[PDB]
Amino acid sequence: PQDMPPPGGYEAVQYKRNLPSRGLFRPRPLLAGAAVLMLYGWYKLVKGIREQNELAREKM
């Protein structure tokens, strides 16, 4: 026999465009989490510089 398809034919393949939006790359959560990092970082910075200026007062 020659090279034929199987009796019922092959099952469908995937060809339609498939680029599904993933929550890892959405501009709301990224902006929000950026704001939390950026606001906490300034919080620690206020503590740090306030302590360093006091450390500077003792050295003087």
Partner 1 sequence: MATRKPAFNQHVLLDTTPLPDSIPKVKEIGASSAPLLSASFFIGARCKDYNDDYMQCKNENPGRGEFECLKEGRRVTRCARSVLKDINTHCLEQFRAHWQCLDNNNQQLWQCRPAEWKLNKCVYENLKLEKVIPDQPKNSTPVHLRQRQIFAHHAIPPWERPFIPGQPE
Ligand X SMILES: CCCCCCCCCCCCCCCCCC(=O)OC[C@H](COP(=O)(O)OCCN)OC(=O)CCCCCCCCCCCCCCCCC
What residues make contact with partner 1 under the rule CB under 8 A? 47-48, 50-52, 54-55, 57-59
Separation between Cα atoms, residue 27 and residue 33, nearest integer Å:
10
Q: Residue 49, interface with ligand X (CB under 6 A)?
A: no
**Which of partner 1, ligand X, none lies near 58, with the C-beta cut-off 5 to 8 A by kind?**
partner 1
Separation between Cα atoms, residue 56 and residue 49, nearest integer Å:
10
Interacting residue with ligand X among 19, 23, 55, 59 (CB under 6 A) = 23
* Min dist. Cβ of residue 2 to ligand X (A): 48
Whether the CB-CB separation of 57 and 50 falls below 8 Å is answered with no
